[PDB]
Design an enzyme around this catalytic site. Structure first.
Site, PDB file in Angstrom:
ATOM      1  N   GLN A 158       8.803 -56.678  14.148  1.00  0.00           N
ATOM      2  CA  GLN A 158       8.705 -57.026  15.564  1.00  0.00           C
ATOM      3  C   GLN A 158       7.247 -56.849  15.986  1.00  0.00           C
ATOM      4  OE1 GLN A 158       8.775 -58.353  18.971  1.00  0.00           O
ATOM      5  NE2 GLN A 158       8.551 -56.134  19.193  1.00  0.00           N
ATOM      6  N   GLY A 160      16.876 -57.338  23.280  1.00  0.00           N
ATOM      7  CA  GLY A 160      18.002 -58.277  23.336  1.00  0.00           C
ATOM      8  C   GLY A 160      17.735 -59.464  22.428  1.00  0.00           C
ATOM      9  N   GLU A 186      11.781 -64.244  20.531  1.00  0.00           N
ATOM     10  CA  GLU A 186      11.695 -65.709  20.416  1.00  0.00           C
ATOM     11  C   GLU A 186      10.894 -66.221  19.193  1.00  0.00           C
ATOM     12  OE1 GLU A 186      10.355 -63.721  22.917  1.00  0.00           O
ATOM     13  OE2 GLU A 186       8.367 -64.446  23.430  1.00  0.00           O
ATOM     14  N   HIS A 210      17.714 -67.649  27.091  1.00  0.00           N
ATOM     15  CA  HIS A 210      16.383 -67.086  27.315  1.00  0.00           C
ATOM     16  C   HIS A 210      15.475 -67.299  26.103  1.00  0.00           C
ATOM     17  CE1 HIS A 210      13.549 -64.155  29.115  1.00  0.00           C
ATOM     18  NE2 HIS A 210      13.300 -63.842  27.857  1.00  0.00           N
ATOM     19  N   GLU A 211      15.964 -66.919  24.927  1.00  0.00           N
ATOM     20  CA  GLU A 211      15.168 -67.118  23.711  1.00  0.00           C
ATOM     21  C   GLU A 211      14.911 -68.605  23.416  1.00  0.00           C
ATOM     22  OE1 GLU A 211      13.696 -64.593  22.642  1.00  0.00           O
ATOM     23  OE2 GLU A 211      14.958 -63.151  23.694  1.00  0.00           O
ATOM     24  N   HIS A 240      12.011 -69.764  25.592  1.00  0.00           N
ATOM     25  CA  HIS A 240      10.705 -69.409  25.037  1.00  0.00           C
ATOM     26  C   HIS A 240      10.104 -70.482  24.102  1.00  0.00           C
ATOM     27  CE1 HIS A 240       9.627 -65.604  26.723  1.00  0.00           C
ATOM     28  NE2 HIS A 240      10.695 -64.968  26.270  1.00  0.00           N
ATOM     29  N   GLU A 293       7.275 -64.563  30.639  1.00  0.00           N
ATOM     30  CA  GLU A 293       8.624 -64.082  30.970  1.00  0.00           C
ATOM     31  C   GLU A 293       9.255 -64.662  32.231  1.00  0.00           C
ATOM     32  OE1 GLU A 293      10.264 -63.082  28.805  1.00  0.00           O
ATOM     33  OE2 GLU A 293       8.798 -62.417  27.318  1.00  0.00           O
ATOM     34  N   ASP A 340       3.597 -51.294  25.157  1.00  0.00           N
ATOM     35  CA  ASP A 340       4.981 -50.861  24.974  1.00  0.00           C
ATOM     36  C   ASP A 340       5.400 -49.886  26.065  1.00  0.00           C
ATOM     37  OD1 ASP A 340       5.301 -52.377  22.648  1.00  0.00           O
ATOM     38  OD2 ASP A 340       4.788 -50.720  21.306  1.00  0.00           O
ATOM     39  N   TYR A 400       9.463 -60.081  34.213  1.00  0.00           N
ATOM     40  CA  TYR A 400      10.662 -60.923  34.185  1.00  0.00           C
ATOM     41  C   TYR A 400      11.138 -61.275  35.584  1.00  0.00           C
ATOM     42  CZ  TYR A 400      11.184 -59.480  29.247  1.00  0.00           C
ATOM     43  OH  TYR A 400      10.972 -59.225  27.910  1.00  0.00           O
ATOM     44  N   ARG A 412      19.027 -50.807  21.082  1.00  0.00           N
ATOM     45  CA  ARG A 412      18.385 -51.704  22.064  1.00  0.00           C
ATOM     46  C   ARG A 412      17.806 -50.834  23.160  1.00  0.00           C
ATOM     47  NH1 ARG A 412      21.702 -56.693  24.994  1.00  0.00           N
ATOM     48  NH2 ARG A 412      20.019 -57.569  26.290  1.00  0.00           N
ATOM     49  N   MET A 413      16.494 -50.917  23.344  1.00  0.00           N
ATOM     50  CA  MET A 413      15.792 -50.010  24.251  1.00  0.00           C
ATOM     51  C   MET A 413      16.317 -50.061  25.684  1.00  0.00           C
ATOM     52  SD  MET A 413      11.928 -49.652  22.990  1.00  0.00           S
ATOM     53  CE  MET A 413      11.367 -51.326  23.159  1.00  0.00           C
ATOM     54  N   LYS A 414      16.720 -51.256  26.114  1.00  0.00           N
ATOM     55  CA  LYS A 414      17.375 -51.462  27.407  1.00  0.00           C
ATOM     56  C   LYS A 414      18.516 -50.475  27.639  1.00  0.00           C
ATOM     57  CE  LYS A 414      19.616 -55.102  30.205  1.00  0.00           C
ATOM     58  NZ  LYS A 414      20.166 -56.486  30.175  1.00  0.00           N
TER      59      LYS A 414
HETATM   60  N1  LIG Z   1       4.304 -54.611  28.507  1.00  0.00           N
HETATM   61  C1  LIG Z   1       3.809 -55.313  29.545  1.00  0.00           C
HETATM   62  C2  LIG Z   1       3.964 -54.829  30.840  1.00  0.00           C
HETATM   63  C3  LIG Z   1       3.469 -55.530  31.929  1.00  0.00           C
HETATM   64  C4  LIG Z   1       2.813 -56.730  31.714  1.00  0.00           C
HETATM   65  C5  LIG Z   1       2.645 -57.198  30.419  1.00  0.00           C
HETATM   66  C6  LIG Z   1       3.143 -56.510  29.317  1.00  0.00           C
HETATM   67  O1  LIG Z   1       2.977 -57.043  28.052  1.00  0.00           O
HETATM   68  C7  LIG Z   1       3.004 -56.282  26.835  1.00  0.00           C
HETATM   69  C8  LIG Z   1       4.295 -56.370  26.030  1.00  0.00           C
HETATM   70  C9  LIG Z   1       5.079 -57.518  26.014  1.00  0.00           C
HETATM   71  C10 LIG Z   1       6.247 -57.548  25.238  1.00  0.00           C
HETATM   72  C11 LIG Z   1       6.610 -56.440  24.472  1.00  0.00           C
HETATM   73  N2  LIG Z   1       5.828 -55.346  24.490  1.00  0.00           N
HETATM   74  C12 LIG Z   1       4.702 -55.287  25.240  1.00  0.00           C
HETATM   75 ZN   LIG Z   2      11.417 -63.229  27.133  1.00  0.00          ZN
END
Ligand SMILES: Nc1ccccc1OCc1cccnc1
Ligand SMILES: [Zn+2]
Ligand SMILES: [Yb+3]
Length: 606
Positions: free
Chosen positions: A131, A265, A268, A292-293, A296, A315, A372, A380, A560-562
């Site tokens: 990932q 989840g 893409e 969603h995917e 993308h 997003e 992260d 989103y 899943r981190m969510k």
């Molecule tokens: N993480 C993040 C927060 C606010 C705006 C942009 C961002 O992008 C970095 C990111 C995207 C997808 C997965 N991990 C980190």
């Molecule tokens: Zn997305």
């Protein structure tokens, strides 16, 4: 400027192509091989350049058949260590060379999870998945780890012969490995220029079943039949997406259903979307994630955020297209329902962070911020809310969809900023500039908190959810008897979920109310991950000890981190479960996904 990357920027040099030749060593948990980067100078007299790396061991760098000088800088935390390469001959502008780097990954690569046989479904073979989003590609191979650069790629991946390799690319054949007959080499080609965060690899005991004219679903054999059913709307959604976005350019659209520790989840990855097995509800009810995917494939993969500061572009537009796909399938009222649910999730995020927090701005400044750590629902849902507001300002969904398609056409194969987007919005809607000027751009794009203006939402599907939630919230002990299973009779799984979301916004509720809820609604029986997630959060926040082993089980049995992050946080905040929550994290940490393990650690202050 990309403040998440340490590499030479695109104005200096551009990677045009990667040829990856590597072998997956499960006994050592390393990927070993060569990354041959085809690099084009953007400058006169270019004599050096810098690449991103993270936890990589470099053996050598070869250009024109000879080893050249390079140096690794000091590690800069989550960014990794910059790698400066001394070019043997100064390059003029537009000149291209091939730089071949011999490297090995570390077992601790933040891009990779290595799973033992016991962590898999089959229990007989190990498994590896990647990932890269946002800045984890540098933890697999030296590259300009920035989405401002797009490259094509080819790859040859040697793996144990009983295992299967797949990548975010077209499969280009397999042969036994001449250097080791216990191995196979899988080959891959990605002919469409992509940002490196979309590079992906899985190696495992994978099987496939076709579910549409351009889609195979891939998983361990134990999950193939369920997945094929769960994701059968995939082709219908592709046809809708193609109608809204223009041609699908990627050839195939395959699905890979990961083991339970996959941190998102979905992801893409071009030609091969990765999804969590927590979508396998049995009734297709979590298919918005596929929508969603799929989306993308245009917003994100064709039009790309230039830096991660502009992640909302990726997003927001994707959630926007996602909701149109589901509105086409299930009706405009459902689109409004999901849109309004999204606003609710944004309320949650802004409340969690704090209304003045920098991560609640639409456009963020990631300087010295780990992406992260900053990741949330904001890009989103605040991004979607802006687009939905604009749709309503500018004449409605038909009109705004004309903009979306033109936008995709305009910026395909390119990397862009928020200003690029806004410039094009003004260009496209030139006869509605008066109306665009009514928008509070500074607030929407750059201010923290909830947006300055809330869009208009149809309430039809939401009303029963709010009504029931309000009954429970306002109920006293002598009202509890009036609740009954028939209350749910006319509610979809989506509405049950929204009922629980509404109630969770007011948690805790009295313990006796929650006990009654279980008594009459039997939410404990529901395996829908979204529903079960909110229900367990509601139980833990309302201090029901019976729910503790249930929340612990869900937090750990999938990753899943969510779901995993807030369950651990709730468990930690409940005095009765605090100690066990911390102990469970400690015991599982080494065998968790490295990003997830890092973040849960931060959440628990452990
Ligand atoms: N993480 C993040 C927060 C606010 C705006 C942009 C961002 O992008 C970095 C990111 C995207 C997808 C997965 N991990 C980190
Ligand atoms: Zn997305
Ligand atoms: Yb009463």
């Amino acid at each position: 400027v990309d403040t998440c990357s340490l590499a030479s920027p695109a104005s200096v040099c551009r990677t045009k192509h990667l040829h990856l030749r590597c072998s997956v060593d499960f006994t050592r948990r390393t990927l070993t091989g060569t990354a041959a980067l085809t690099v084009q100078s953007q400058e006169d007299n270019l004599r050096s350049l810098v690449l991103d790396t993270k936890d990589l061991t470099i053996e050598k760098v070869v250009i024109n058949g000879q080893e050249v000088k390079y140096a690794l800088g000091e590690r800069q935390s989550y960014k990794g260590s910059p790698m400066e390469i001394s070019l043997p001959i100064a390059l003029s502008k537009n000149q291209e060379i091939v730089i071949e780097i011999s490297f090995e990954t570390s077992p601790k690569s933040s891009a990779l999870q290595w799973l033992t046989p016991e962590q898999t479904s089959g229990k007989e073979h190990p498994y590896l998945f990647s990932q890269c989003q946002a800045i984890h590609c540098r933890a697999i191979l030296p590259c300009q780890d920035t989405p401002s650069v797009k490259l094509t790629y080819t790859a040859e991946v040697s793996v144990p012969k009983e295992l299967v390799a797949l990548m975010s690319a077209i499969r280009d054949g397999e042969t036994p490995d001449p250097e080791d007959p216990s191995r196979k080499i899988y080959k891959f080609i990605q002919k469409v220029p992509i940002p490196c965060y979309l590079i992906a690899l899985v190696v495992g005991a994978l099987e496939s079943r076709q579910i549409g004219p351009r889609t195979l679903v891939w998983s361990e054999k134990e999950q193939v039949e369920k997945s094929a059913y769960e994701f059968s709307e995939t082709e219908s959604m592709l046809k809708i997406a193609e109608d809204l976005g223009g041609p699908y350019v990627w050839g195939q659209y395959d699905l890979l259903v990961l083991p339970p520790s996959f941190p998102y989840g979905g992801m893409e990855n071009p030609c091969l979307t990765f999804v969590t097995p927590t979508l396998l509800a049995g009734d297709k009810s979590l298919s918005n994630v596929i929508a969603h995917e799929i989306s993308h494939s245009w917003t994100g993969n064709l039009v790309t955020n230039k830096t991660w500061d502009h992640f909302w572009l990726n997003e927001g537009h994707t959630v926007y297209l996602e909701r149109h796909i589901c509105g086409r399938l299930f009706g405009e009222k459902f689109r409004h329902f999901n849109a309004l649910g999204g606003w609710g999730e944004l309320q949650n995020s802004v409340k969690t962070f704090g209304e003045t927090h920098p991560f609640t701005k639409l456009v963020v400044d990631l300087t010295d911020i780990d992406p992260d750590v900053a990741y949330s629902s904001v890009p989103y849902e605040k991004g979607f809310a802006l687009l939905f507001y604009l749709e309503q300002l500018l004449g409605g969904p038909e009109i705004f969809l004309g903009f979306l398609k033109a936008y995709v056409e305009k910026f395909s194969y390119k990397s862009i900023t928020t200003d690029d987007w806004k410039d094009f919005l003004y260009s496209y809607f030139k006869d509605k500039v008066d109306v665009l000027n009514q928008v509070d751009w500074n607030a929407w794009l750059y201010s923290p908190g909830l947006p300055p203006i809330k869009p208009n939402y149809d309430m039809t599907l939401t009303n029963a959810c709010i009504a029931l939630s309000q009954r429970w919230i306002t109920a006293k002990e002598d009202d509890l008897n009036s609740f009954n299973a028939t209350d749910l009779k006319d509610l979809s799984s989506h509405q049950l979920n929204e009922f629980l979301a509404q109630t969770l916004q007011r948690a805790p509720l009295p313990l006796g109310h929650i006990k009654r809820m279980q008594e009459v609604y039997n939410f404990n029986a529901i395996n829908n991950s979204e529903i079960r997630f909110r229900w367990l959060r509601l139980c833990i926040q309302s201090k029901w000890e019976d729910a503790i082993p249930l929340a612990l089980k869900m937090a750990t049995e999938q990753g899943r981190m969510k779901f995993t992050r807030p369950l651990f946080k709730d468990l930690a905040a409940f005095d009765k479960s605090h100690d066990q929550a911390v102990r469970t994290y400690q015991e599982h940490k080494a065998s968790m996904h490295p990003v997830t393990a890092m973040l849960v650690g931060k959440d628990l202050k452990v």
